[PDB]
Each structure stands twice: as C-alpha cells, then as structure tokens.
From a paper:
Otoferlin is a Ca2+-sensitive multi-C2 domain protein and belongs to the ancient family of ferlins involved in Ca2+-dependent membrane fusion processes. Thought to be a core component of the SV-tethering and SV-fusion machinery, otoferlin is anchored through a single C-terminal transmembrane helix, cycles with SVs, and hence, it is found on both SVs and the plasma membrane of IHCs. Otoferlin comprises at least seven C2 domains (C2A-C2G), of which four (C2C, C2D, C2F, and C2G) are thought to bind Ca2+, involving aspartate residues in their top loops and likely also phospholipids in target membrane. Our structural work used a truncated construct lacking the nonessential N-terminal C2A domain and the C-terminal transmembrane domain of otoferlin (residues 216 to 1931).
(A) The high-resolution cryo-EM map of mouse otoferlin (216 to 1931) bound to a lipid nanodisc [comprising 30% PS and 10% PI(4,5)P2] and viewed from its N-terminal side. In the high-resolution lipid-bound structures, we could model nine Ca2+ ions (C2C: 1, C2D: 2, C2F: 3, and C2G: 3) of which six, bound to C2F and C2G, are part of the lipid interface of otoferlin. (F) C2F recruits two PS headgroups, originating from the nanodisc bilayer to its three Ca2+-binding sites. Moreover, we could resolve two PS molecules of the nanodisc, contributing to the coordination of the three Ca2+ by the C2F domain. In contrast, both C2F and C2G are oriented toward the nanodisc membrane with their top surfaces, allowing for the aspartate residues of L1 and L3 to coordinate Ca2+ and engage the lipid bilayer directly through the bound ions, consistent with these domains playing important roles in late-stage SV exocytosis. The top loops of C2G are rich in aromatic residues [F1746 (L1), F1747 (L1), F1833 (L3), and Y1775 (L2)] and histidines [H1776 (L2) and H1832 (L2)], which all appear to either insert into the membrane or position close to it. Different from C2F and C2G, the Ca2+-binding top loops of C2C and C2D in the membrane-bound otoferlin structure point away from the nanodisc membrane (but see results of MD simulation below). We used the membrane- and Ca2+-bound cryo-EM structure as a starting point and placed it so that its center of mass was ~4.5 nm above the membrane. The membrane was modeled with CharmmGUI and contained anionic lipids PS (30%) and PI(4,5)P2 (10%) mimicking the composition of the nanodisc. The simulations reproduced the interactions between anionic lipids and the C2B, C2F, and C2G domains observed in the cryo-EM structure.
Numbering used by the authors: 238 to 448, 464 to 666, 693 to 1265, 1317 to 1343, 1398 to 1930
The structure:
Amino acid sequence: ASVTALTSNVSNKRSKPDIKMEPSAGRPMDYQVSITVIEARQLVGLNMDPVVCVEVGDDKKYTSMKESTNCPYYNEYFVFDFHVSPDVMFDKIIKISVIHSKNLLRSGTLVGSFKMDVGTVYSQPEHQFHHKWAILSDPDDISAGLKGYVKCDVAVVGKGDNIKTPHKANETDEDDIEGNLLLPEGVPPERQWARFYVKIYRAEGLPRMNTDLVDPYVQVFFAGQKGKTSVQKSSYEPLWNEQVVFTDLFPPLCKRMKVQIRDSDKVNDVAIGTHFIDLRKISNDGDKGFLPTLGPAWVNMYGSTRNYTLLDEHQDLNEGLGEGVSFRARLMLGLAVEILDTSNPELTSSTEVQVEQATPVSESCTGRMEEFFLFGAFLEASMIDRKNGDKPITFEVTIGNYGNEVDGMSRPLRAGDLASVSSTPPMRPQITDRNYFHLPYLERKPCIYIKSWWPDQRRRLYNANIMDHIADKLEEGLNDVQEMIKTEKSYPERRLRGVLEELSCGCHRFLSLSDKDQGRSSRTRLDRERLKSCMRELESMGQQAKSLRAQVKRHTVRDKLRSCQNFLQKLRFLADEPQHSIPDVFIWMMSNNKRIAYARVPSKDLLFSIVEEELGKDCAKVKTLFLKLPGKRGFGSAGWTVQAKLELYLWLGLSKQRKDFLCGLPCGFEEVKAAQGLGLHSFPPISLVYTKKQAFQLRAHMYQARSLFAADSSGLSDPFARVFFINQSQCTEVLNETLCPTWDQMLVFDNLELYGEAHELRDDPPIIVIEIYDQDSMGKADFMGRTFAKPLVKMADEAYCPPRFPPQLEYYQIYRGSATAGDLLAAFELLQIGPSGKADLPPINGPVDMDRGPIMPVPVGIRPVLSKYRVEVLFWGLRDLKRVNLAQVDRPRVDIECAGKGVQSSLIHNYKKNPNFNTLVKWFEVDLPENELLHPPLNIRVVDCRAFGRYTLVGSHAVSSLRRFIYRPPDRSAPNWNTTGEVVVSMDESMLDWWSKYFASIDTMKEQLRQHETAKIDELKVYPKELESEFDSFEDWLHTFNLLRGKTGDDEDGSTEEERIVGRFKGSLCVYKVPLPEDVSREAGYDPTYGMFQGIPSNDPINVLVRIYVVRATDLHPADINGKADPYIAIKLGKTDIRDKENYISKQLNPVFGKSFDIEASFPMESMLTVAVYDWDLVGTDDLIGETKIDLENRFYSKHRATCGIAQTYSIHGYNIWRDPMKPSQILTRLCKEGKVDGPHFGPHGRVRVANRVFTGPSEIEDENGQRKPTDEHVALSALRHWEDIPRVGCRLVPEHVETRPLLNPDKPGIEQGRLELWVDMFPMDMPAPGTPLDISPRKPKKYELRVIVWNTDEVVLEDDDFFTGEKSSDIFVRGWLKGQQEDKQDTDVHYHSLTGEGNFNWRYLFPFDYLAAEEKIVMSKKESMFSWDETEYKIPARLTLQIWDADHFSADDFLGAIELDLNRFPRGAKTAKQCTMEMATGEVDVPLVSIFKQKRVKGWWPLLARNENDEFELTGKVEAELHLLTAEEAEKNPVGLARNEPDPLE
Ligand SMILES: CCCCCC(=O)OC[C@H](COP(=O)(O)OC[C@H](N)C(=O)O)OC(=O)CCCCC
Ligand SMILES: CCCCCC(=O)OC[C@H](COP(=O)(O)OC[C@H](N)C(=O)O)OC(=O)CCCCC
Ligand SMILES: [Ca+2]
Ligand SMILES: [Ca+2]
Ligand SMILES: [Ca+2]
Ligand SMILES: [Ca+2]
Ligand SMILES: [Ca+2]
Ligand SMILES: [Ca+2]
Ligand SMILES: [Ca+2]
Ligand SMILES: [Ca+2]
Ligand SMILES: [Ca+2]
C-alpha cells in the first residue's frame, strides 16, 4: 500500500474536549443472564435423581427432577434479571451445580459444581457460550476426580446489546464433550487445585467509626468464598500479619477478589473501604506467563467522606460500588498462588477457608519513605452552583490524610518545620448570572502546599505514565481519524498510518526507558513479572502496529480502526498499576466547613520526572477540573448543574526535585509567602500576585443547533444558549418552539483579562462551557444540555489570514449527563487586544436585519455560504394519530419547515374516512449551505386544524440528516443501465411437509453463518433478523417519520422514545440544487404534478388480506412463578384484535405454534401489524412477554414485492406448493408492465426473453399424479429469481422466508426477551383470492411400541448376606422404563435366592410411545404435578433404561446396576454373556453403534454398571434382552401380552 502518512492533527478534534461531568462509571444498567441447561452426562452417583441448581449471584433456580439416571436431559431455560453497575454485575458468580434427594425438608446432597463469574461469559466473542459442557468437580475435596459434565448455554446481555443467537435446529448429533468444554480460550481442560494466600499485614490512616475509636478487620471475598482476619480492637493503625487462604481451581474463572476493611460493632457491621484485585492484571497465562502474585505492597482504598454521621448516604462508596470521594485507609497486602499436588496424600484434601499467621515483612520491602511535595495554584474558580454559594467558599486539597484539617490528624510524621497550608482562604462569591457564581481571585491566586511521606515506588507510576502517554497519543489519533472520517476530510489513511507509526515508535520508546531501574532491591515479584510482560506485550504491539500500518488502505480505514481500538484497550488494561504507591489527590469545595463537591486527580498524572514520557500528563500544567456531587448525587437531575469549575495548576514530586515546581505557571507573578518563608528562595508561596495581564476578546459565533432535547410538553423547546468564559457569561436570544434553533448570533466578551503570559496559550486555550436552556413562561429554565469548546487563539502579532482564520463552524457534541442531546454548530476565537488597541481586531459588522439592533450576526466568512435548493415533499398519509389533549385528531395538516422557508400540505378535511392528501407533491425553495454536513434539519410538524385559526400541536419529527434524500444526478452511463446485448442465463417424497423444507433451510442458514467464520429438498430463506434488516426497511420510495410529543425522558427514568410516538407521517423528501439541468430533469421524467416522485403507486384505499404465519418462538422470558410461561399469539391490526387464549401452549418457553391468522385490513390505514406473545394466566390479567411491529404499509407498496415471497422452485403439489394465487408468469407480466420492460416473451415453453436477457429452465410441470403438461412457470420463476440482474428497473425480490423478529417489552426496554419466527403474506382482495393457508402446524408424532424381552441375567452381584449361615445371594429382578419411572416402569417377577447371579425371567415389556423422527424425541402429554391446571407436552430423548435390583421383604429394594441405551446410538449386544464386557457401555469407540429405528430387532447381552466408593465404574451384572421396535399399525396386527401372558406366551 501507500507509505505516505500524516503525523500532526488535521481534523481539529482538540477544540472539542470530551469532558465527562459525571464519572460515567458504576452507573447501574439492566442486565440479563440467560442459562439453558440442556442435559448432563457421566454424572457420579448411585440411583441418583439429579436436579441442576443454577445460581447467579444470590438468586438460584432449579430444574425438574429426573429419576434414576446418570445422563439426564432437561432443556430448561432460566432468566436472571439484575439492575446493577457493570462491576457488581461481572463479579456475580454463576454456579451450575447438580444435587440429588432434594425435597421440602432436606437440602440436596451435592454431586459436583462449576464456578465461573459473569465477566468470563461477557468476555466471550458473542458474550456467550453455546452448547458447552461444564466440568463438574467436588468443591469440598481436592482429591476427588471428575463429577460429570452439564451441557448448557450461558449468555449475558446488557441494555442495548446484540447477540448473534444460533437457531434451534434438530440437534441429532453426538458432539464431543472434551472438544466442547465450558472454558474460555487458553484454559487447560484439566484444572489443578491451588491455594490463594491473601496475606494481610497492616493498615494505616483509618477514620473515626464509633462516634470515636475503630475496631477493624479485613474480609476477603473470592469466587463466592469468604474469610476474615481477627479484630484489632481500638487502633487506627492495626497490625494483623494474617493470611486468608482460599482453596479453588486454577486458573480461576472468577477473576476479581474483593478485599474489604470492615469495622466491628455490635449494633451494625459497616464497611470502611474496598479494593478489588483483578487477577487478570496480576497474572499471565501460558508457559511464558506467571502465577497470580502481588505485594508486599500498599493498596489505597477510597469511599465516603471520613467525617462521622449517624446515617451515611454515601455508604455504598465504602462498599466499593462507586467512585471514591475521600481517602479511607491504605493497606499492606500480598497475594501468592501455590499449585497443590493433589496426588500427594500428606496434605489435607479439605477446601475450607483457612486463616493462618502470615510471615511478617519489613517496611523496607515496600520502598524507603521519601518526602513528597504537592503544590497547587487556584488560578480560576468559576461556575459555582448558586444553590450552595450564599456563604464564603474554601477549596481544600488532601492527598491521603495529609492536609485533612477539618476531619482530624490521622497522620504520621515521617524546609525545616514547614507547616502545610492545604486550604484556600475563604472568599465570598460574586454573581455571574442567575445560576452560577465565581470567586473573584483576579490577580491574587490562592495557593496550597502539602508535605507528605510515601514509599518510593515512583518507577511503577513512571511505567504507567509512559504506557498511558502512548495510550493517550493513540486515543487522540484514533479520535482524529474518526472525526476526519465523519467530517469527510481528505485522505484519512495517511493519518491512520501516521498514528500506527507513532504508536510503534512509542512502543519502541517504552522498552528503552523501563529497564533503567533493574537494580532496585525494593521491588516485588509482581513488579518484575509485570515489567517483563509489559515489555513483551509492547514489543509484540510495535510489530503488530507495523504490520497493521502495512495494511491500511482507502477502503479499509473503517476496519483497521477497530483493530487499533483493541490496541487502545490493551494499553489501557496494561497501564493500570495494581500496586498502589501514592493515593489520589482530592480537591473539595467547602462552605461553613461542609463538603459540597469533589474532584479526584490520579496521583501519577501529577508526578514529576526528568524524562518527558515518565512525566505525568497534568504535572506542571493548568488542569481544568469540574467538581461534581459525591456518590449518587452527581447522577441525574442533581448532577446536571456544574458544581464548580477550576483552573488548578498542580505539581507533585520529590522535595529534592522541587527546584522547577513553578515553571508551568503563566509568567509575570510575584510570590507572596508566609512568615516562615521570609527571605527563603525555596519556600513555596501561599499566593501569587500577577502583575502581567493580557487584554482579550472572545467571539462566540453561535450559528445553529440541531437534534436538541425536548423540555416542554409539546415536544419542543424554547432554547437559548449561555456561553461561559472565565468569570463572565452572555446569553443568546430565545427562539420559541424549536428543537433546531438558528440563533445566528455573535456574543462578544469585551475587555477580558487573562492574568499572566501563559505558556503555550495558542496550543492550550482556556475552555468554554456552553449550556443550552429551555426558557419557560414564569421565569425558570430547564437544563437542556452542555457542550465544551476551545477557542482559536489569535495573538497580537498574528495575521487574521487563511488557512487558520476566520474559524469555520463545527459541531460540538452536547450532553445531558451521558445522554447525547444534540449538536451545536458554532465557532470560537480568542483574539488578543494588541498594543494598538482594538484597531488590530477584525471589523464587527451590523446585522442584515436592522430590527435586531444590538444583537450581532455571525459574520461573513464564518457563516456558511448559501445556495438555492428545492425541497420536494411527498405527502402520502398520516397513520395512528393518537389523541391530543382529550379530543381526537380530526382535521390534520402537515407543516414542513426548513431554515425558515417551508410548505404546508393540503388539509385533510376528515381523517377517519380517508387519511390522505389531495395534493400528493408540493415543494418549496430554501437557501441551504454548500457543505452538505452543515445542512439544517427539516422539521415535519403535524397540527390539528380547528376553526377560527386555532391550531394544536399533534406531533413533530426532526429529519436530522437530509443527505439520504439529496438527489444527486445518477450515472446512467454505467454498464448496469445497458439494455443491449444478448445475455443467456441457464438453470420417500410423499412424507415431506413444510417442516422438511424449514429444517433444510435452518441447516443451510446454520452452515452459511459458519462459512464466513473461516435427493434434494427445495428451500426457503431463513433470516436471522427481521425482513426489514435485509431490504433496508423497505424505504426505497416511502419513508416513515415518527411524530413525537411530550418531554424527552431522563437517562434513568421517565418517558421513553417509543412512548413519545404519537403518530407516523408517511412520505418522502427530495432535495436538489437549483437550477436543475434539463437533461437531468427529463432523465427523471418530472411531470409537473409529481416532481421527482415518479412511479408513485395509487393512493386509493384497497382491502388487503393479511395472513400471518407464526412458526415458533424461542427463548421466551418467563412470566410465571414456576419459571415458565404459557404463550399464545395475539395479533392487533387495525380494529381487529385477535387474542388466541384458547390455544395457549402450557409451560413452554420454546413453543412451536404452527398457526395462521387471517385479518382483512383496509390498507393503507390499517397497516401497523403488532404480533405479540402473551403468557396466559388462570387468575389475573395475561402478561405481555413481548411484541413486534412490522409496518406492512412499507412492505405492500415496495418495489421489492414484499407481499408474498417467491419460492425457489415452482410446483403445484406437495410440500413445496406455490402459495401465491398469482402464478410466476403473472408476477413476471405484472413486473414487466409496471417497469415498462419489453416482455415477457415466451417462445417455446423452456425459455423466456425479458429485456436483453434470455432465461432457460425446465419446461414441464408435475400435476400430482406423475403426468406432465408443458408450462411456462419454471422459466418465469427463474426470471423472477434473477430479477435483480434486469438493467432498467431490476430489483432483488423478496423470497419465501421465515424472519426472526425480536420480541420487545416496553416495561423491560432495551433487552430482547424473545425471538418470534414468522412471516407475513399479503394478498389484495381485488385480485383472485388465495387458497387455504399452508399446513405449518407441528408434526404429529408417529406411534410406536418397543418390546423388550428380558430373557436372563448373568454374573449379577450378590447383595444379600445370610443372617445365619453367611453365604451370599441376590433376589434379582429387572426394572425397565422408556418414558420415566412414574409413567412406563415395569418390573419382572423376582428370581428369588440366586446363589450365582443367574436369573431366569422371560418377561416382556411393552412401551407404547409417540416419536418425532426429526427431533429424535419421545413426545408425551402429562401434568407437571398433581395440582396443575393443564397437560404439558414434554420432549425427552428416546432412551430405554434397564436396571437390576435386589428385592427385600423387610426393607427397600437395593439398586445393583443400570444401563441407559440411547435408542439411536446404543452399542450392539454381545452374542454370549462371556463376550459382554465393561467396554461396551464405557467410552471405548471400538464397539459399533446400532439404531433400533433402522435395525428394528437387536438381541444380545448388555453390561450394567454401578459406581463404588472409589467413584469408578464396575461390572455388577449382565442382562440378555431382545429389543423389537414396531409401529402401532404393526402392533395391532400382531398383538402380544404383558409379561408371559397371551398372545405369544413366554415360559
Ligand atoms: C397466594 C399465592 C401467591 C403466589 C405468588 C404470587 O404472587 O402469584 C401471583 C399469581 C400469578 O400471577 P403471575 O403469574 O402473573 O405472577 C408472576 C409474575 N408475573 C412474574 O413473572 O414474576 O397471581 C395471582 O395469584 C393473582 C393476583 C391478582 C388477582 C386479581
Ligand atoms: C386436583 C386439584 C387441581 C388444582 C388445579 C389448580 O388449582 O391449579 C392452579 C394452580 C396450578 O396451576 P398451574 O401451575 O398449571 O398454572 C397454570 C398457568 N401456568 C398459570 O400461570 O396460571 O394450583 C396451585 O398453584 C396449587 C393448587 C392447590 C390445590 C389444593
Ligand atoms: Ca467499632
Ligand atoms: Ca419547560
Ligand atoms: Ca419552554
Ligand atoms: Ca403469569
Ligand atoms: Ca401463566
Ligand atoms: Ca398476570
Ligand atoms: Ca437386600
Ligand atoms: Ca433381597
Ligand atoms: Ca435393602
């Protein structure tokens, strides 16, 4: 590829800071874990009744009990719902266990368990595992072996996540367990046991917790286990030297460990601080990796404010559930992993959590204590919330507990006797405006200085600073590439190649810097191993960056960019230091000593170094901080207002390195120092008095906004924008009833004073805060959003000349919290008033409209150049207009306005009889910018026309981008438009049904979704998503515009976007430049009454028969207390509201409906199709599982012909019968007549000519009896299948299909909780009517009867011992069933007192059962319990179970052995009892497998196995059996009796 690259910034993203006002982390979000326990195999137990218990967090659910099987089958679906933050969510433990003998009084005996947290599932490629086997292990015994496997799906979805879900085909497979384990990639299939020594040494700096002492201990949580140390009573500096040892599998699938200091109290046990150790960050896998190690090193814990209160509203911060607002404690800590030798018998095999005495460590192992100096300079404090600032305001800086004056001296003491001044002097605020204050610092900036003592682990922070510097440059470069992609700047591939080259240079630079301290003795094992890992990963990263730079091309910019995103995330993951050294710096606003708002600067960001890459990104720089409310108060409505805005200079480093700690400040200040600092050059000042000052003038060219927040009940706003710069604020004018105001207003901040000649003021200007506000009637203003900007600084010596000046308008992203609230098209420049005064400034011109007066416009050269455009609007109709106020909408009219100009539609004089417009096409002319990116949005605004000029607003939609509707002149010289040149294109049955072709299409789709990851059945096209997702929503000529009314909801609660829809406007737009050329006009026709919209179909009402075929549903959300649902299909279309409550499928979460519903709807009025799934309830209302909206109006009028899908092949009989009443010849004739194509010209019956192309195919049809007639329909359907290749009006037609539409619940938004497979046919009733609906009803199971003649038994173990003489014997009888123990169990008579294991039975079982051949499942209908309302259909595997039992007269019968013959895959029986061995039933592949549905008679010997105390299989008996499968029709013709009875007796 090309080698040319760009290194510098081109796209001006640096003038748009992405300031996060809220922390944007730890926000709660709806999560869902769906777990489908499919089956289990090879479970360890004797006569076990296994129940799978599935826990996610604390909630646990159970499957049904399967009786007397070591390989049960469940196919049961569980859904766990949570509303928690992602860190809490991913720490939840998914535990899949198998228990037995559980009843109402006794907890079940545990067989085996599997542990894996939610975050392991979420880190999967599709956030899920599909068809994987959980390795069960004994969690209480390290010497125990494998306890079985549980095949299961585990999936995690957040709000708005999309998962490719595989379709539920017939799983008639014998897939390998060991090749499909439930483990992440890189984890070995056999996992050893290991011990996690969480050594806890001591803690320092604890706050008050009783009123006033504290009694701390440390509780450690790991993988669901917990253990705690002793309580060190009455100590702020506790000392434990105690290790908490967990025994768990390695490598652990629960990857976070929660260390938590707690205070012991008899009233309530309370948390002090919480730190999470990430095991990913302290370990590496593979042979080159290392075991999880940490320490002995300090760890910093953060939480609530340390002042004592009786009730703490920020107690969740002490639990680690949010960002900490104050320093709580620091804790020496270590972690070690020792892999246990499980074969060695000397150590104990128990797994319970030990608390032992750890070996104490010295303080010198963490690094020698060094004196750190922190300096601050509050250059500016503005934008303080007026709800607090009636009283004087201080700013207190604290690092650790140093400088915490108000909460007490919990500080050890480690210039001479320099007293730390950590708080600014109090000063009364002055009014900026009605919402904000500012402190009048002016020339006197207050300063702070804090002396602290920390261990000298600066090397960790330096390495993190280097790698975070590389990550910062990479993130800035990727934002540059994305922004120049979005604004369509030329050649983004050069910028991406330069970014990759710079990333490779930084990765090479890290390796030369990080090895300069290898000789340090105060260096943990984690430091050495992580340094080696980071060096290896960054060298591999530099090589991968060079390789990816070699692959960047023009068309491949958009897919190498996400490849660089995982580089960015790997640098961010590696850049976090798990061994904390210096705690973060906190800056707090106070008033009357009450803590109000905080900022938290990371300590490594302020650290000083000689090397530029080791230097922190905020060290010796003026940092813009936005203080926020602590805890949950910074979220939502309370966190909307800016609490404060600081320009805070900060420096941190050693006290030996503080010679240049004032170098980053603006020049021209005099240091005012305390009484201790008189005559001392090195003493830091308590304030700066600036003598230099520079006059400035900021111009805010606020031209336009778009897509703004709606803060009025009409769905609109009255937005005006307030611009904040330093200590001043100015407002634009209020524009009424719009969400896209064109203010066109320049705000001039005259004679500003910038104190001090700032270092690099051109490259780092002060930030501008822009706040939108909805003006209201009696005087308040709703917060409408906030964006940030950086002005283009023009110095006095600079010329106001291109290419830098005048600044162009750019879009600044507006936010309300975290939600996007539109864009602000504005430009900002910061012009210095020179020595000559204001004459050097560019001229300020008067307004074009003289009535505006003192309001200045955006000047020429900054405002966009306008050109004439014509917007042509098609007014197709208005659908589903909801009630405005209480009344109905009766005379609607559509006013469409763009950039002040506009047109109004014809008034619909009566909405009910015909919601249509008399004039279909109207147009207006409007000046729009040359740049298509700067085009203002077009507003659709439907009003209800009452009498006497009184209009009420029904709804409003904002078309944000007009570029979809922009008519460029099409290229008709392309070879696709060529219509000349001849092109030639060439081409046990009676048991098939629609399910045959459906399963064939499902298999074809399943292999087609695996192709890109690297007799014959005619098929259809199964879509994994909606049909709209394939055919671009059928919006080829007709578009939908959802009208909205009411206020937009908040980011957490309130209204939602789908609730605010009060109607739909049907129509299209076509925007083109004026004048349009005449040849372009005649290429598009341009009839004067239709404009650009040629080929528009008839607007008249037409009756349409809508036939909805509902096939099945998958993964339905449970809506009953038993974890299941009783789904039925409820379809709403127009006035027809079918609710099929009589045909519900009871207790099924994957129902097979097989239904068809006929609804006659008057199109285009009755066109919103709502197919819903409802859980039927015996008492109370039926619950909505989910629903989908299909919008048949787009389907009916589309050029894709979405009315009826066209089949792959044509026939008039059988499973592939042609559904459409219009034959393929008629469809081809209609498509040629509508498209004005010459044709279809049928010559001989095997060919047709459509335009320049000739199709050929078979020429004869089959009329159901083997006889043939000549026909034209095969070649017509071949032409219809290749209709996309037609040159002039060719189009990909909709095939016969089954679409998978997600089911959405408004009560549980954002999470898909169902997948309804369906398809919709539409037939106009003025055409000939279709026939009967297709029989897509589910397959009736074929009736069978399996006859199992148990002849004899041999070598049965003798269970009984004689009480008087002592010889062994056994009362052998055989127990057999096919469906279950409570439904098909039959026992032979007892062969009493067998002294050798030989039994003689000659006993015939009969097992009548219903069978589905495709699913290989026995179908049976039975009640779930005795107290149940209805019979439930169950599908179980066809498995014959034969068991040997010993009959006891005075006790229960004793289980001896069993075999579970799968009737499709059971081994062949041996010819004699001698040839029967252990290897037939176990995992040896050398024994061939036989299906009884093919062989139809198998006689032989089979082994019966039982597990002893050593958990191994042993041969406890052999049985001779004669399986003989018959149909029911064969069984009635040849009847036999039970046991030995007539007919066909047995001896
Ligand atoms: C007394 C026995 C209580 C047993 C526990 C209990 O509360 O059962 C509620 C039952 C079942 O209702 P659902 O299946 O919708 O609740 C399940 C829910 N949708 C979910 O999915 O969580 O309803 C009634 O008894 C009728 C109430 C209204 C009567 C007018
Ligand atoms: C012979 C007695 C029959 C009694 C039949 C009866 O009353 O059934 C109602 C329910 C059981 O109904 P389903 O679980 O099938 O719920 C149906 C569907 N899933 C729903 O959601 O509603 O009974 C109980 O809860 C305990 C009753 C104890 C009565 C002593
Ligand atoms: Ca206490
Ligand atoms: Ca309002
Ligand atoms: Ca308002
Ligand atoms: Ca229910
Ligand atoms: Ca129900
Ligand atoms: Ca209900
Ligand atoms: Ca016995
Ligand atoms: Ca006995
Ligand atoms: Ca017994």
